[PDB]
Design a protein around this ligand. Structure first.
Ligand SMILES: *[C@@H]1O[C@@](F)(CO)[C@@H](O[C@H]2O[C@H](CO)[C@@H](O[C@H]3O[C@H](CO)[C@@H](OC)[C@H](O)[C@H]3O)[C@H](O)[C@H]2O)[C@H](O)[C@H]1O
Ligand SMILES: CO[C@H]1[C@H](O)[C@@H](O)[C@@H](O[C@H]2[C@H](O)[C@@H](O)[C@@H](F)O[C@@H]2CO)O[C@@H]1CO
Ligand SMILES: [Ca+2]
Ligand SMILES: [Cl-]
Length: 496
């Protein structure tokens, strides 16, 4: 259950947040495949509530109406087209599965849905599934409000409504079956796995019961017996009765401690320093590496809607963000997910962004196409961090050093550190307020290597910084605290 199911040599997935199916299919062929990306996490493909107040917020997609593959990203035909084209190019698709709940209980009944399906939250009626009052936990929840009120009580966290979201009775075989029917529909289409949204709000046993009904991956693309990749969204920063480890029997889990701590470290909050990252991983209280899905930021916490707090680094913090992502992609701990977002009118008032609800770039509610600029960046307000040279090249770096051990660690006791991966890669970071100029042991064979952060290796030549490794594996590195990118990375495939 725990394997990403990516092609050998591809070690990362990217979240193409709110991207349309047709756009992802093209990206798979024109960029993701050639650049060695392992897969794509797509936004919920199932019909959701169409919210006009505010105007089509991104979170409306987390309020299911039915399991029809009909959304602002496209219809079933477009979804299949995308999965097939991506799979045909060796890039996997992972679905953001919203199966813990339906829409908000306060939402007005009617046909304000992405596929016109009728629904009535008040009467608990979702005929397009179909679900009825008998399929929700209204009678199971014991809180006075019917909503989750105290996280110290593991029971209400699972049986009550998350911020009013109608909670499905996942103990019922009928409900489990309707969800499996939806997920099997996707697996048969060709999806390689799923992100289980709000897993903390579901009983480990109920999730397992659902997974037990899931098919193996489509044998036209995957070897027989291939199980869908499962990564459960569990927000556990410690201090709660519910632990992410309670879900290890179903698959991997999102390690929100990862981005939160890395952000605090890179920002140097409360006296933290990169030198402390020497024992990064389980040593910091994180889950086992083979059960972790890591990331610097996600669609939720990049806009203050998730765990991590104000320490989370995002594309808005471009310089520090690139370093955090680089460190993550270079370090062996966990399975890495790169974030790809869109720009929005961030407006901070009293420490809170009042425009954190804004949906993807659009024209009258119609998601804008992803355009590619001659410099390979994206237009139409799509950030496309996965296309940033510094990030794209680190994604490749991880592929190249796949399997190599963490070694040759170095640090100045402050914020200047470096480490290698076996004899296939080496990375140096300078997050101090002074320059870093020193000769280090790289563990790499002698030769001239192109720094993949400041440049690229094109036709036997480096476009950016060049590093010279001697016969003893040592090499001189020089990084000024004023460099655009205060870190250098070199690997086996960047050698001249
Ligand atoms: C997982 O799925 C979620 F729903 C729960 O973690 C996502 O949460 C986001 O979407 C919800 C739903 O739109 C949003 O809450 C809105 O709707 C509820 C219900 O009516 C309102 O409560 C009264 C709430 O104020 C609304 O904002 C969440 O705020 C949003 O974070 C989550 O991101 C997914 O990972
Ligand atoms: C060809 O443009 C490159 C650019 O040289 C590289 O620096 C990066 O640009 C990012 C930048 O790193 C980031 O800090 C912020 F300014 O955003 C831009 C992209 O919008 O990548 C591009 C494309 O590879
Ligand atoms: Ca629940
Ligand atoms: Cl997540």
């Amino acid at each position: 259950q725990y394997s990403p199911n990516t092609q050998q040599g591809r070690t990362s997935i990217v979240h193409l947040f709110e991207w349309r199916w047709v756009d992802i299919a093209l990206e798979c062929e024109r960029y993701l495949a050639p650049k060695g990306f392992g897969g794509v996490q797509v936004s919920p493909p199932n019909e959701n509530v169409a919210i006009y107040n505010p105007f089509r917020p991104w979170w409306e997609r987390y309020q299911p109406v039915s399991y029809k593959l009909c959304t602002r990203s496209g219809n079933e035909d477009e979804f299949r087209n995308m999965v097939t084209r991506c799979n045909n190019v060796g890039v996997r698709i992972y679905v953001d599965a919203v199966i813990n709940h339906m829409c908000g209980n306060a939402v007005s009944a009617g046909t304000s849905s992405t596929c016109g399906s009728y629904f009535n939250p008040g009467s608990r009626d979702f005929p397009a599934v179909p679900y009825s009052g008998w399929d929700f936990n209204d009678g199971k929840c014991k809180t006075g409000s019917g909503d989750i009120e105290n996280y110290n009580d593991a029971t209400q966290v699972r049986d009550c409504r998350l911020t009013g979201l109608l909670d499905l009775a996942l103990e019922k075989d009928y409900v489990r079956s309707k969800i499996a029917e939806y997920m099997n529909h996707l697996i048969d289409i060709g999806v390689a796995g799923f992100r289980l949204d709000a897993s903390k709000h579901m009983w480990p046993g109920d999730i397992k019961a659902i997974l037990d009904k899931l098919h193996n991956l489509n044998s036209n693309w995957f070897p027989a017996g291939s199980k869908p990749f499962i990564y459960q969204e569990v927000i556990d920063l410690g201090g709660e009765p519910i632990k992410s480890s309670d879900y290890f029997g179903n698959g991997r889990v999102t390690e929100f401690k990862y981005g939160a701590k890395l952000g605090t470290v890179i920002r140097k909050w409360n006296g933290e320093k990169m030198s402390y990252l020497k024992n990064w991983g389980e040593g910091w209280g994180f889950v086992p590496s083979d059960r972790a899905l890591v990331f610097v930021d996600n669609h939720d916490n990049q806009r203050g809607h998730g765990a991590g707090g104000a320490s989370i680094l995002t594309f808005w913090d471009a310089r520090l963000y690139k370093m955090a992502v680089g460190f993550m992609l270079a370090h062996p701990y966990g399975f890495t997910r790169v974030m790809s977002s869109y720009r929005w009118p961030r407006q901070f008032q009293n420490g809170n962004d009042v425009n954190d609800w804004v949906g993807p770039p659009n024209n009258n509610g119609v998601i804008k196409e992803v355009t590619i600029n001659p410099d390979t960046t994206c237009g139409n307000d799509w950030v496309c961090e996965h296309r940033w040279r510094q990030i794209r090249n680190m994604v490749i770096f991880r592929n190249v050093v796949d399997g190599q051990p963490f070694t040759n660690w170095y640090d100045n006791g402050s914020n200047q550190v470096a480490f290698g991966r076996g004899n296939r890669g080496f990375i140096v970071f300078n997050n101090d307020d002074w320059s870093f100029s020193l000769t280090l042991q790289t563990g790499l064979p002698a030769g001239t290597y192109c720094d993949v952060i400041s440049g690229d290796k094109i036709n036997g030549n480096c476009t950016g910084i060049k590093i010279y490794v001697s016969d003893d594996g040592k090499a001189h590195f020089s990084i000024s605290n004023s460099a655009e990118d205060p870190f250098i990375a070199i690997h086996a495939e960047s050698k001249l």
